[PDB]
Structure 1
Amino acid sequence: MKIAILSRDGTLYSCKRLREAAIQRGHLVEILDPLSCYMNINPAASSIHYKGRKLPHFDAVIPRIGTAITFYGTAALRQFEMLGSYPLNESVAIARARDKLRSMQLLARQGIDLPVTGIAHSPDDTSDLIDMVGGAPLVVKLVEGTQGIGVVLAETRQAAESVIDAFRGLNAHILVQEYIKEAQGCDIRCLVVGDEVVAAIERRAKEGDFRSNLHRGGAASVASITPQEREIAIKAARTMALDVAGVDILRANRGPLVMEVNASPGLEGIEKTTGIDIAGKMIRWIERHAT
Structure 2
Amino acid sequence: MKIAILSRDGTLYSCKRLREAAIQRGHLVEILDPLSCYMNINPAASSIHYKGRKLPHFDAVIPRIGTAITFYGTAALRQFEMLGSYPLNESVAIARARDKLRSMQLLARQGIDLPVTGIAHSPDDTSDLIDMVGGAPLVVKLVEGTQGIGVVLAETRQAAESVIDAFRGLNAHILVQEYIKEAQGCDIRCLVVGDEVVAAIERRAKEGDFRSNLHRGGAASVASITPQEREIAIKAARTMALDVAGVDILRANRGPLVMEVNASPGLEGIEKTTGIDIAGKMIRWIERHA
TM-score of the superposed pair, with normalisation by structure 1 = 0.98
Conservation of the 8 A alpha-carbon contact between 1:144 and 1:171 = no
For the residue of structure 1 that corresponds to 2:143, the secondary structure is strand
Shift of 1:171: 1.1
Cα distance per residue 1:48-91 (max 9 Å; x no partner): 00000000000000000011001000000000000000000000
Q: How much does 1:149 deviate?
A: 5.2
Question: Residues of 2 paired with 1:148 and 1:255: CA distance?
Answer: 23
Say if 1:142 and 1:148, in contact at 8 Å, map to a contact too. no
Q: Percent identity?
A: 100
Contact 1:191 1:198 in 2 (8 A): yes
CA–CA separation in structure 2 for the residues paired with 1:175 and 1:255: 21
What SS is found at the alignment partner of 1:242?
A: coil
Relative to structure 1, the CA distance from residue 198 to residue 147 in structure 2 (aligned partners, 3 Å threshold; closer, same or farther) is closer
Question: What per-residue deviation string (whole Å, max 9, x for no partner) do you get for residues 262-290 of structure 1?
Answer: 00010100000000000000100000001
Q: 1:215: Cα distance to partner?
A: 2.3
- Give the structure 1 partner of residue 94 of structure 2: 94
* Contact persistence 1:145–1:172 (CA under 8 A): no
Q: Note if contact 2:267-2:278 (Cα within 8 Å) is conserved in structure 1.
A: yes
Cα deviations by residue, 1:116-175 (Å, 9 ceiling, x for unpaired): 000000000100000111111100011349999521111111111011011114210100
Q: Secondary structure at the match of 1:68?
A: helix
Whether the aligned pair in 1 keeps the contact of 2:147 and 2:215 (CA below 8 Å) is no
CA contact 1:138–1:179 (8 Å) conserved in 2: yes
Shift of the 102–176 alpha-carbon distance from structure 1 to 2, 3 Å rule, reads: same
CA distance in 1, matches of 2:229, 2:96: 23
In 2: Cα distance, 1:74 partner to 1:146 partner? 21
2:37–2:50: 8 Å Cα contact kept in structure 1?
yes
Deviation at 1:95, TM superposition (A): 0.5
Q: Is the 8 A contact 1:100 1:146 kept in 2?
A: no
Q: What is the rounded CA distance, in whole Å, between the counterparts of 2:106 and 2:188 in structure 1?
A: 21
Give the Cα separation in 2 of the matches to 1:147 and 1:13. Answer: 19
Looking at structure 2, the residues matched to 148 and 240 of structure 1 have their Cα atoms a distance apart, in angstroms, of: 23
Change in Cα spacing, 1:149 to 1:48, as seen in structure 2 (3 Å) is farther
Q: Runs of 4+ in structure 1 displaced over 4 angstroms?
A: 144-149
- Larger deviation, residues 134-143 vs 82-91: 134-143
Name the structure 1 match of 2:32: 32
Computed over aligned residues only, the root mean square deviation of the Cα atoms, in angstroms, reads: 1.4
CA distance in 1, matches of 2:94, 2:144: 18
Output the CA distance in 2 between the equivalents of 1:81 and 1:208: 47
TM-score of the two chains, using structure 2 as the length reference: 0.98
- Can you list the C-alpha shifts for 1:105-125, whole angstroms capped at 9, x where unaligned? 000101111010000000001
Residues 121, 169 of structure 1: 8 Å contact kept = no
User: Could you tell me how far 1:216 is from its partner in structure 2?
Assistant: 1.3
Contact 1:251–1:257 (CA under 8 A) maintained in structure 2: yes
Q: 1:60 to 1:6 in 2, by over 3 A?
A: same
Residue aligning to 1:206: 206
On the 8 A contact 2:148/2:211 being kept in 1, the answer is no
Establish whether residue 215 from structure 1 lines up as the match of residue 218 from structure 2.
no
SS of match in other structure, 2:148: strand
- SS where residue 73 of structure 2 aligns? helix
Conserved 8 A contact 2:4-2:30: yes
Residue aligned with 1:188, SS: strand
TM alignment of 1:43-192, pairs within 5 A: 43-144=43-144, 150-192=150-192
Q: Which moved more, 1:201-210 or 1:169-178?
A: 169-178
Give 1:9 shift.
1.6
Aligned 8 A contact 2:147 2:213 in 1:
no
More displaced stretch, 180-189 vs 135-144: 135-144
Q: Distance in 2 between matches of 1:124 and 1:70?
A: 32
Return the alpha-carbon distance in structure 2 between the equivalents of residues 266 and 145 of structure 1: 17
Tell me the number of residue pairs that the alignment of Structure 1 and Structure 2 aligns: 290
**Conserved? CA contact 1:99–1:146, under 8 Å:** no
Cα distance in structure 1, aligned partners of 2:246 and 2:150: 20
Instruction: Provide the residue aligned with 2:269 in structure 1.
Output: 269
- Residue by residue over 1:196-243, the C-alpha shift from the partner in whole angstroms, topping out at 9 and shown as x without a partner, is 000000000011100011221111111111101111111100000000
Give structure 2 stretches of 5+ with no counterpart.
none
